[PDB]
Design a protein around this nucleic acid. Structure first.
Lengths: 89, 91, 314, 103, 290, 81, 57, 50, 91, 81, 103, 91
DNA sequence: GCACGTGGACCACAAACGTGAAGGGTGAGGCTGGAGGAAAGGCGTGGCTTTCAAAGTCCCTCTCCCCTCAAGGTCCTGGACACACTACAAACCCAGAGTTGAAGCTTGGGTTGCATAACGGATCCAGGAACAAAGTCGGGGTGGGGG
DNA sequence: CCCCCACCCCGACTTTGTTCCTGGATCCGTTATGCAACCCAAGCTTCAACTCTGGGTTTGTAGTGTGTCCAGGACCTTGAGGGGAGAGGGACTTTGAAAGCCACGCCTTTCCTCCAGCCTCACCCTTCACGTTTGTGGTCCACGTGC
């Protein structure tokens, strides 16, 4: 489950706060829901282009399609920075 | 006696402020089993499943009620009529 | 709101107790997390005992010490009569470019020119004294000494020829459980601008955005605390206006590499704060594009402060 | 861990295994899990941030489902992303139509 | 039965917990003189308050004070009033502590430096961001020499914000020249110039070396200070450095200073180019005292 | 099992309408609402039972309810997913 | 316990007496040794008269 | 006899309660207050009003 | 002229029986390219895509107008108002 | 170019509304309709352009329009696929 | 032919291949495509029968999208199954509300 | 590239021998076939996953059909798939 | 009469209490990551030629534009009644408890299964020719309104 | 009810698309081998079912008042319907060359394999936060009694 990471994230955002178990379950459900949305959209995109591999391009496209523009810009920036830092080291 | 509607406003504030289930769980559970038997008899249910059903039903009904209220307002009306529900559902 | 009120008051009692426990634990030495409240009180008990014993048997002076050392262009240094260094203040790195670890345990005469070793050996070895049971050593006129010598500078490239600085030692001889000399060392040549060599925080960072002319388009709330300039003081100006002379070329190379790759990490470089200090930095860069044609629109720059040790290591 | 190499909290290994399962494609490009983990972590951060704000605005220190509902229905973009989503004990925004107000 | 039994051990472990805590509260109280002197059982809350209230350096103080030079002063940012000054100011400005404390630094400043000190006093373990450093002219009790040039270095500090700083009267002459046997770093100052040679940036070492304060150089041409005997050579270097990225080092040359005399300098020059625009930003110079 | 539709009390309907911001209710709503709820809930139940049956199980699990709601555009958080 | 109740009771009576003395001290035609009830009656009359006379000044 | 004296003490304490309420009636703050005030509070308010 | 409404009913019959596009093609193409330029320039478009857009738009608009008509009827109106459209979209 | 939204003429909107059985129309409708249609078109076009861009093409094909409509919940038959 | 074995028109081989594509699963039982093809053929037959009836009602002998629109929108089950589909050149059902008719 | 025009046409001749089909209508029908295929395949995939099954069988299809299709259509389609699989298994 | 006493009142603290929530520790093994290799996916170069862009011209439908006048939307007014609000009575829901065992879940055994590959083979797909369908224009029949 | 006008559907002619025939293949199908996914038999324990008792908040039923919904009259202005004129649309035709598609060669990316070892998960123990009661004491008061 993602409880560990949800908690750690909160400890980076609002260190002075805690989470009810029900809220934590809600976050797990939400994570899996969004994961499914993106993975399915990316699967379609690969099919629409007869590709066999899902890459950061497909995810960026699926994000731009799925998310509203504001969140899409920030999320694309985050994915870009993460991939940049990872690949650079 | 307070005036008709004033207590209704206090109730609206109360129930919007609260988050608890508004349907009685045992009536709901027996209604579920009364429906489910039609599809399969001798069927068991996880209590959590029954709770999920109730929450989904209350959420769905609350949304439909809000839409219906908008319909009544459009008709420049306060009391919601089955016409309003039917129009919302048709839309 | 009756019982909500009583519960508010009781939760407030709870809160006040928690606040006092946190305050009590915060002042301790060797601080750590995950201590149970009983452990917090026990460590406070032990700390009260230890502090009371050490003090009984004995603006802030730290800020005054920093201010005066900086104004004098100086650093504390302590060495044994044998010439071996035993302690030095970190400010030495900003003044002579040697780390404390490069100095401690090493012979001072490795940094003093060989033509002047006899003088400093005479200074250290000719003085000998035994104190009474009543008077501290630093207060006796016999132990005070003022003298001058040259000292070698450190370098980032060992190919550079040996370079030195003339300095004045102002200090006193002191006994340790051997006899050392400890002094405030002042550079004879004043240093009106200097480099910060150690980051005063574990990590600190600031962000900005730059145009295709490298002019500031944005400065975050974390920059002014680090560099001393407010956003409006930098907006529209070129980033190059704040970089160090020698690092201008390497930073041009880094921005050429960034134009080549669109993203990456920079070399180390220096930035001139409003407080007249060069601070060493390393920056991560990436570029954003105008959807209508996928061409650049702005560069984003994330600046991290780094230590002179990490600089000299690479 | 690749997450550490990316400075991320989320388990990139798990994400890659999950994408390699579920039959979403024949192959997975190595950058895809990192990108997705970053997106998930970002959305999580936004949601938790709004939730903590809601809690503090009501002097609470613990996030409960009501806070999530409030945050999600108040935030327009999340309300779009999650318009049809339902939350246990979520409740509603205290919306009252002006025509209903007494005078 | 098993549930009740499981609750006994746990609840009495919680009893052990409150017993431990009360024991430690009492012990902590014993270590607080006021709590130990108080007869009554002080409540855990009051006990904790009193505990947090209840919770070599002189060698170092002498080690640094004996090495001290110039004078320390404190001036309120909102005030401009000198809140404190060390006795050594009487060696420097010839005004005493009593002549300075309770009075505003700005009349002791030269009228053209008052604005600069005000800009420095604006807000934005002493951190580099709060750091401030400036040259200025300060009045003296015995007089053109009614003012002297002081280097002031300090940091901003807090209810009334203030600058805590040292003012030092450095000799503009260079005592103890370097020995020929030893490679010693000569004094230097960095400056940047527009195409025509007008100062667009300069440092404080330029004020120590040239006596001119920064505003006295900015907005003026280097040709106003070059000596005519070297202006031909320096102009040749200027014409050359405009065409190349290479660092060009001049010969030794004379440069005029505030008091009207000349000093000998040698400079390294280059025209820096911004890669994003492929354009020369400005001439960069490092000057060196000969 | 009979008449459990009457188990949905007029006050329960009133409370739900109040949570929906409704100020006034026509009596016909109570039966209209009971019918609408029966339809909605029966469809959800049919789907959940279909999941249970395919799984060859004799107990309905919350995951089946979640799938039934999901496929009907009624995604629900709080019961796993 | 009984000592502390005695202390708080004497404190109660001392506070009451201090207040009675302060109240009576502001009156016109002041004289000591007045009974508590007389202090309050004269204070009542004094407040009435002073308030009326000041308001209608 | 002691009963008569103690009930004279009651007459006195009743007279004092009555005059404390009357004094309160002349103090605006006391006249406005809702709860049955404790004696010291009434007298403090009275000396504050004068 | 005929009395208003009758000819409108004739028009309604005509357009319900018909299947062709009721919009002008070239204005539609220009509007599409006017919008599309904002997302990316130098774009090329298959006429099939243009026709797909035209059909989808007319279908969507006609469905929305049907719901709007229902709302107006509910409001006891023959004439549709922007509020009807807003309400239908919101629902 | 610009201002082609006014190219959606009032008679065209009249025809459309009449196909929706609309007997009468208020003038305010036409601008409101133009705005709604502009929003609808903008969304569909954004999605189609996104598909095209990911495919690295420069030409919009009806298949992209159909994929956009599909993911928007509206399915159009008869344009391939 | 598999279709012949099942007494069907639709190609079982194509359906089976399409199921192995799309990453729908790791394995596919032999009877799966048969059942699916039968269902598809049945639905196709329903639609085409209704469409031909509509064409005959419209005195036509070839199916056009108008006929498909009318048929699908008239059959309640198909209408529920396909309510959110749009049909090229389909038109609309000739529905007019009584309130709009003259009286 | 592949389409179902052959089988659509043969089925048409089964239901209405006297009747033909236009290419526009044929495109409609092909889009429909593909859409239904996608619906069923996706639902069956989810079903198999929900049950940690790697194989799709006629049970998964029958369940997806029951979930997707309205009642009457579901009964007939289930009977048809049953008959088809029965005959195919016998043959 | 006052002060102190005791009972009483009231306040609030103070502590423990146990319960509920949470966290720390230890076990622990599953899962992540790395090495090593194979070979498939993708990048890259070089070429073509299909499709959309872009435009021209004429005919013409459709749009632009203007006015009239009745019908529809709207405002304003009045009635009553379906609904809300209070009340007492009741019940079944809620809570907590007990009791029973069908089914969930794990283990081990064994099988039937479907994938995969090679190979066989013939129905399907690209293309060529002929016929029917589709597009465009004109005529006839049907449907509704107005007189 | 009958006549006139407008619209809707059908019919005819011309051009383009689809269907049927022909050749080559590879999609479809078969038979084989293989490793194993899953069914099956079996046993073990759990969670759900089922039931009861007791409490009491919620629910049901009943009575009374009015705010809301509805109908109605009546204004007046907005849209519709038509006429009439004019323009860009629509249809059809044209050409240009850019972009998407294709084929060829290289190589390097990630699956697959096996392993190593530690982070995340489960359980177990322990602690803290919390309400909440209560203990407990103090502040203070109301009026007794004593001094």
């Amino acid at each position: 489950s993602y409880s560990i990471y949800v908690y750690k994230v909160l400890k980076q955002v609002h260190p002075d706060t805690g989470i009810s178990s029900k809220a934590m379950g809600i976050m797990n459900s939400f994570v899996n829901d969004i994961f499914e949305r993106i993975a399915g959209e990316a699967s379609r995109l690969a099919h629409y282009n007869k590709r066999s591999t899902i890459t950061s391009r497909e995810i960026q496209t699926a994000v731009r399609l799925l998310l509203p523009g504001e969140l899409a810009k920030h999320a694309v920036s985050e994915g870009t920075k993460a991939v940049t830092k990872y690949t650079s080291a | 006696r307070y005036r008709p509607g004033t207590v209704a406003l206090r109730e609206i504030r109360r129930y919007q402020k609260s988050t608890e289930l508004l349907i009685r769980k045992l009536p709901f559970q027996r209604l579920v089993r009364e429906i489910a038997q039609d599809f399969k008899t001798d069927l068991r249910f996880q209590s959590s499943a029954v709770m999920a059903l109730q929450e989904a039903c209350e959420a769905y009904l609350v949304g439909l009620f809000e839409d219906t209220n908008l319909c009544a307002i459009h008709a420049k009306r306060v009391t919601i009529m089955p016409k309003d529900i039917q129009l919302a559902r048709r839309i | 709101a009756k019982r909500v009120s009583r519960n508010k008051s009781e939760k407030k009692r709870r809160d006040q107790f928690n606040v006092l426990i946190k305050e009590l634990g915060s002042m301790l030495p060797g601080n750590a997390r995950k201590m149970d409240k009983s452990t917090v009180l026990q460590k406070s008990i032990d700390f009260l005992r230890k502090h009371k014993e050490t003090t009984a048997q004995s603006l802030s002076n730290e800020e005054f010490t920093q201010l005066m050392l900086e104004a004098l262009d100086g650093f504390f240094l302590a060495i044994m009569t044998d010439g071996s260094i035993i302690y030095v203040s970190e400010s030495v790195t900003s003044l002579l470019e040697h780390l404390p670890s490069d100095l401690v345990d090493q012979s001072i005469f490795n940094f003093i020119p060989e033509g002047e070793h006899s003088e400093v050996y005479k200074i250290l070895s000719t003085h000998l004294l035994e104190s009474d049971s009543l008077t501290p050593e630093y207060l006796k006129s016999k132990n005070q000494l003022e003298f001058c010598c040259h000292m070698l500078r450190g370098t980032i490239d060992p190919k550079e020829p040996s370079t030195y600085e003339y300095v004045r030692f102002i200090g006193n001889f002191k006994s340790l459980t051997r006899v050392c000399f400890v002094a405030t060392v002042r550079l004879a040549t004043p240093q009106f601008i200097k480099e910060m060599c150690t980051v005063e925080e574990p990590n600190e960072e600031f962000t900005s955005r730059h145009s295709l002319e490298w002019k500031f388009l944005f400065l975050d709330h974390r920059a002014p605390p680090i560099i001393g300039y407010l956003p409006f003081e930098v907006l529209g100006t070129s980033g190059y206006d704040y970089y160090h002379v020698d690092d201008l070329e390497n930073l041009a190379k880094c921005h050429e590499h960034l134009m080549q790759y669109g993203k990456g990490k920079s070399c180390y470089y220096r930035f001139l704060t409003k407080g007249q200090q060069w601070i060493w930095l390393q920056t991560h860069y990436y570029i954003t594009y105008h959807q209508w044609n996928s061409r650049p629109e702005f560069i984003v720059c994330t600046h991290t402060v780094v230590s002179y040790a990490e600089v000299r290591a690479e | 861990t690749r997450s550490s190499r990316a400075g991320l909290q989320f388990p990139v290994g798990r994400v890659h295994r999950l994408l390699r399962k579920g039959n979403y494609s024949e192959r997975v490009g190595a950058g895809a899990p990192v990108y997705l983990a970053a997106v998930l972590e970002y959305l999580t951060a936004e949601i938790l941030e709004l939730a903590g704000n809601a809690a503090r605005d009501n002097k609470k220190t613990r996030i409960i489902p009501r806070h999530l509902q409030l945050a999600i229905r108040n935030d327009e973009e999340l309300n779009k992303l999650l318009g049809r989503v339902t939350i246990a004990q979520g409740g509603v925004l205290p919306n009252i139509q002006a025509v209903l107000l007494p005078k | 039965g098993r549930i009740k039994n499981a609750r006994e051990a746990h609840s009495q472990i919680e009893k052990r917990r409150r017993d431990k805590m009360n024991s430690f509260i009492d012990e902590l109280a014993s270590l607080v003189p006021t709590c130990n002197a108080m007869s009554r059982k002080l409540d855990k809350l009051t006990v904790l308050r009193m505990a947090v209230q209840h919770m070599s350096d002189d060698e170092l103080k002498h080690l640094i004070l004996r090495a001290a030079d110039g004078f320390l002063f404190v001036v309120g940012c909102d005030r401009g009033k000198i809140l404190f000054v060390s006795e050594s100011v009487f060696k420097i400005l010839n005004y005493s502590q009593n002549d300075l404390i309770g009075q505003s630094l700005f009349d002791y400043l030269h009228p053209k430096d008052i604005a600069k000190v005000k800009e420095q006093l604006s807000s934005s373990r002493l951190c580099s961001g709060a750091r401030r450093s400036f040259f200025c002219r300060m009045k003296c009790n015995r007089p053109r020499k009614s003012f002297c040039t002081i280097h002031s270095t300090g940091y901003l500090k807090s209810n009334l914000s203030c600058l805590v700083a040292i003012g030092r009267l450095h000799s503009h002459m260079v005592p103890q020249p370097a020995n020929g046997e030893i490679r010693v770093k000569s004094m230097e100052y960095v400056s940047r110039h527009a195409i025509d040679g007008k100062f667009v940036f300069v440092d404080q070492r330029a004020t120590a070396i040239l006596a001119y304060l920064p505003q006295e150089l900015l907005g003026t041409s280097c040709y106003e200070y070059f000596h005519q005997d070297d202006i031909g050579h320096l102009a040749e270097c200027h014409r050359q450095v405009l065409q190349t990225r290479e660092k060009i080092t001049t010969n030794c040359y004379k440069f005029k200073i505030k008091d009207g005399s000349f000093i000998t300098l040698r400079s390294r020059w280059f025209s820096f180019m911004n890669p994003w625009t492929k354009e020369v930003e400005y001439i960069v110079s490092t000057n060196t005292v000969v | 099992l009979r008449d459990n539709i009457q188990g949905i009390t007029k006050p329960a309907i009133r409370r739900l309408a109040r949570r929906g911001g409704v100020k006034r209710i026509s009596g016909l709503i109570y039966e209209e609402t009971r019918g609408v709820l029966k339809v909605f809930l029966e469809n959800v139940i049919r789907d959940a039972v279909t999941y249970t049956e395919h799984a060859k199980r004799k107990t309905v699990t919350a995951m089946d309810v979640v799938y039934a709601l999901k496929r009907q555009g009624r995604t629900l958080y709080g019961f796993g997913g | 316990k009984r000592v502390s109740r005695n202390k708080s009771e004497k404190k109660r009576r001392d506070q009451f007496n201090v207040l009675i003395k302060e109240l009576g001290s502001m009156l016109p035609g002041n004289a000591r040794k007045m009974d508590k009830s007389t202090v309050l009656q004269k204070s009542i009359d004094f407040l009435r008269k002073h308030k009326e006379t000041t308001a209608q000044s | 006899a002691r009963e008569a004296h103690s009930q004279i003490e009651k007459r006195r304490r009743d007279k004092m309660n009555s005059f404390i309420d009357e004094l309160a009636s002349l103090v605006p703050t006391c006249n406005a207050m809702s709860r049955k005030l404790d004696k010291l509070t009434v007298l403090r308010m009275a000396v504050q009003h004068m």
